[PDB]
Design a binder for this molecule. Structure first.
Ligand SMILES: [Cl-]
Ligand SMILES: [Cl-]
Ligand SMILES: [Cl-]
Ligand SMILES: [Cl-]
Ligand code: NA
Ligand code: NA
Ligand code: NA
Ligand SMILES: [Zn+2]
Ligand SMILES: [Zn+2]
Length: 427
């Protein structure tokens, strides 16, 4: 409807309508226009005199609108009873896109990094890119939405307005950016650009010439490139790791039985164990993603997992973790394909599930089979290390059940574990 706020992405409250006839809620207007700019954030129209004119008379609010909004949509305004900033905006855009994604597109954060997203675009049916799946990277600036996102292809594509760096010449990405635009709108505009290039303002002149001279040749090469570079990679869909809190209680219990078979673990302690596992998962995979992008690799393999482990884990933990991961990958590759993936690897932690979580987190275009095996073995090893020391702490205190205090002692009393996990809250 026409009653949404384009800056904060909400129903308008105390709306202020500028002479350019852009409107924004009084909170946003005060934050952006009154405090500093004295210009419309959408079109940059100067409103210096107009604001002072009305501010000294308490006549900023569009009373007719405001008064109309409250009577005609009181239920919607019940939300307005409830009523960083860039982070809030990004999160709202994700919520909206997660519900109904743009046609032919999906996008979501990379791991827990809200300012770095992955996007995928299916080649429009209209276009010669049909059948291909095109990956993109999205970086939001700190002052989003008042500055555009950086959007570039990571999949090679033949197009007059997209070059070998993946850069996209498209006006709304730069000169025509406005905080009224969303990532959903951007991806749709990119889809239209694939269907209808702009050869008159090209990024790659040679391709634009062919598009204007020999369209047949343009279409043939576009299909050839689609087949060569945009096939066999559909992505994980969705919109990132989501808000679900993953549990590994099943596997923590199994490991505890192996390490301390006469020792139990409380429900609160299990919650903390899940926090440890999830935190280590995110840090290792986030670093492996960094390495894949940095080296322009479409697939995360056990190579990036190992290098991530060597950088992030301290001393002996890193060496033992690397040994465990290497041995798991070796056992996995020389095993019978009939058994379960975890069984092939000699692991308790679920290899298939870790593989899915590595794909769901948008860390890379593809994930090789060795990666989840290596990571699952590292998570299992660290879990066993923690449980061994926490059970020792329990036994030191003449207890038979691990509670959060015993987890805090295990971490604090081991120099390397405190380095790795000391920043995770227990309390
Ligand atoms: Cl994959
Ligand atoms: Cl691999
Ligand atoms: Cl105790
Ligand atoms: Cl006793
Ligand atoms: Na309108
Ligand atoms: Na609002
Ligand atoms: Na995804
Ligand atoms: Zn607002
Ligand atoms: Zn304006």
């Amino acid at each position: 409807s026409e009653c949404q706020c384009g800056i904060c992405m909400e129903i308008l409250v105390e709306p202020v309508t500028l002479p350019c006839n852009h409107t924004l809620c009084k909170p946003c207007f005060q934050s952006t226009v009154e405090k500093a700019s004295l210009c419309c954030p959408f079109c940059r129209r100067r409103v210096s005199s107009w604001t002072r004119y009305h501010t000294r008379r308490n006549s900023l609010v569009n009373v007719e609108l405001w008064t109309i909004i409250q009577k005609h949509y009181p239920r919607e305004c019940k939300l307005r009873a409830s009523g960083g900033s860039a982070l809030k905006r990004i999160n709202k855009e994700l919520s909206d896109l997660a519900r109904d994604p743009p046609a032919q597109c999906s996008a979501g954060p990379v791991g827990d990094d809200m300012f770095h997203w992955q996007a995928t675009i299916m080649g429009p049916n209209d276009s010669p890119y049909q059948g291909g799946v095109f990956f993109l990277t999205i970086h939001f600036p700190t002052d989003y939405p008042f500055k555009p996102p950086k959007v570039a292809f990571t999949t090679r594509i033949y197009h007059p307005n997209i070059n070998s760096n993946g850069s996209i010449k498209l006006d709304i990405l730069r000169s025509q950016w406005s905080p009224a635009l969303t990532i959903s709108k951007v991806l749709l505009s990119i889809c239209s650009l694939l269907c209808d290039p702009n050869p008159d303002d090209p990024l790659v002149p040679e391709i634009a010439r062919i598009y204007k001279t020999d369209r047949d040749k343009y279409n043939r090469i576009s299909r050839e490139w689609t087949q060569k570079y945009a096939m066999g990679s559909g992505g994980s869909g969705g919109s990132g790791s989501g808000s679900r809190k993953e549990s590994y209680s099943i596997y923590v219990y199994k490991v505890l039985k192996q390490v301390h078979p006469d020792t139990g673990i409380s429900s609160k302690a299990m919650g903390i164990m899940n926090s440890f596992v999830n935190d280590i998962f995110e840090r290792i995979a986030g670093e492996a993603s960094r390495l894949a992008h940095y080296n322009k690799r479409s697939t995360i393999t056990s190579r990036e997992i190992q290098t991530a482990v060597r950088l992030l884990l301290p001393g002996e933990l890193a060496k033992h973790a690397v040994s465990e991961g290497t041995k798991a990958v070796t056992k996995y590759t020389s095993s019978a394909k009939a058994k379960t993936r975890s069984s092939r690897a000699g692991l308790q932690f679920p290899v298939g599930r870790v593989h899915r979580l590595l794909r769901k987190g948008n860390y890379s275009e593809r994930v090789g089979a060795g990666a989840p095996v290596y990571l699952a073995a590292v998570l299992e090893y660290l879990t066993a290390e923690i449980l061994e020391l926490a059970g020792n702490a329990a036994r030191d205190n003449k207890k038979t059940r691990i509670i959060p205090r015993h987890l805090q002692l295990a971490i604090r009393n081991d120099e390397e574990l405190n380095k790795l996990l000391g920043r995770v809250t227990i309390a």
